[PDB]
Amino acid sequence: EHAKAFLGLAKCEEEVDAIEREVELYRLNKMKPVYEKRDAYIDEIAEFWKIVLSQHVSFANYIRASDFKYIDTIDKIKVEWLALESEMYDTRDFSITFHFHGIEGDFKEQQVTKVFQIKKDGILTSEPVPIEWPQSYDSINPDLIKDKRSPEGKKKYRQGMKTIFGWFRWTGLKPGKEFPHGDSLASLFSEEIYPFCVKYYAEAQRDLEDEE
Amino acid sequence: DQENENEHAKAFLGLAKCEEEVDAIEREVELYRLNKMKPVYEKRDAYIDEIAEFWKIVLSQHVSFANYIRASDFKYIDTIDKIKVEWLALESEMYDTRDFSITFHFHGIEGDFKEQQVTKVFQIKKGKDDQEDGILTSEPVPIEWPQSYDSINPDLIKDKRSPEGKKKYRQGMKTIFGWFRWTGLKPGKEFPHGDSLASLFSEEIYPFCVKYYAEAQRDLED
Question: Do B14 and A41 touch (CB under 8 A)?
């Protein structure tokens, strides 16, 4: 028994999913103007992103220690939700653009955009995007390493692919063969870091305020 | 740096205003969701009423609900055969999007617990200064306690100041029935975590009961 009720409940849950979709699209549309206005003010604050990325708890766990030298050069982060350009896109789909100020003689100033899209629930996927790795990473650079057959050549390949730079060539299509948990890192940016960066910034001052 | 510190000040003022706009947007979005969902909840709840043991299964399925009350109370929680939540913000914009009334119907137990319908109201309140999103508060609402709970019933205990009376008193206030007189305005003197329990209902149990029920029915197979 209860079959009739169960079928009805299944249809109701479908209606709920549809509403959630409409609600999120409504929110994304309303937020676009506010984010633009907000980001313009952020661009006026020196080490904003440096401070935010160092304030986020789990972010640091996704990358290597030696990466913070370059992460600290991030001067701008902009996320754009693809669903605002067309349906066919999940509301979780987005492009994220980073601007690195660089480091004289080691890491060049550059702007890199990576696109994340849901594929079937569902999982994020992406296409590799070019990024010039720090000169300091030549020994662990996948495109450079000559002969990754030796025990050290493999160690170095693994070390480099686990850096934030390895994340840029992540696709989510070869589980176990790419930067670990690239999809979770992406979600960190679109769901936490970009939307609530100001709150992280305020918390960073608050924290350094209690130590005062 | 009179220009930069001024730029930072301008920036901070600008950001504070942006957050205010975000807060306004969040409310507008939530009102839209609640209005669209109201009709779906009514239809879904009508199907739920055709499944007699639905709520008993859902409530035993939730991961933390059980942590709020004595295992002893489940005899009575098992008689709940209807739960309906209504969001107050839909009736007036003076209500916070988190404000709601929850109505329970208990089938009862012969000679011990009367069949009855009870509605409790929860509304946000703030203390000012600190960002404080505010906390939930409520007013006591009448419910007829089980006859067997006579000795721990707050309104029947004569002493409740003596060693044994105080113990019996505290036991009763920790039951689901004690939760009905919770208000959130007398910390340490009421049903423990009455506020978190109320949120469990409006944010988890009522909205996702069907997912909990399915998960429970799924564990009966394989």
Answer: yes
Number of domains present in the structure of chain A? 1
Q: Which of B117, B53, B132, B122 is nearest to B86 (CA)?
A: B122
Q: Which of B217, A149, A157 is nearest to B209 (CA)?
A: B217
Which of B36, B43, B49, B131 is the best mutation test for A, with the most CBs of A within 10 A? B36
> Structure solved using which method?
X-ray
The distance of A129 to chain B (nearest Cα, Å) reads: 32
Q: Which of B18, B155, B98 is nearest to A34 (CA)?
A: B18
DSSP string, B103-159: EEEE--BTTTB--EEEEEEEEEE--SSS----EEEE--------GGGGGG-TTT-S-
Q: What is the resolution of this structure in A?
A: 1.9
Give the H or E element holding residue A54. Answer: helix A48-55
Nearest CA in chain B to A2: B51
Distance separating alpha carbons of residues B80 and B107, to the nearest angstrom: 6
Token reading at B105: 């119907």
Which of B119, B182, B106, B184 lies closest to B145, judged by CA? B106
Report d(CA B212, CA A135) in Å as an integer: 53
How does DSSP assign A90-158, residue by residue? Answer: -TT-EEEEEEE--BTTTB--EEEEEEEEEE---EEEE--------GGGTTT-TTT-S-TTSHHHHHHHH
Residue A190 has what DSSP assignment? I
**Helix pair A194-210, A48-55: axis angle to 10 deg:** 80
Contact B51 A198 (CB under 8 A): no
CB contact under 8 A, A34 and B25: yes
Answer for the pair B194, B173: CB distance below 8 angstroms, yes or no.
no
Helix (H, G, I), strand (E, B) or coil at A58: coil
Inter-residue contact B183 to B139 (CB < 8 Å): yes
For B180, the domain range is 1-222
Other beta carbons within 10 Å of A103: 16
Quickly count: other Cβ atoms within 10 Å of residue A134's Cβ.
Answer: 21
Beta strands (DSSP E) in chain B are 80-87, 100-106, 116-125, 135-138
CA distance A35 to A97: 14
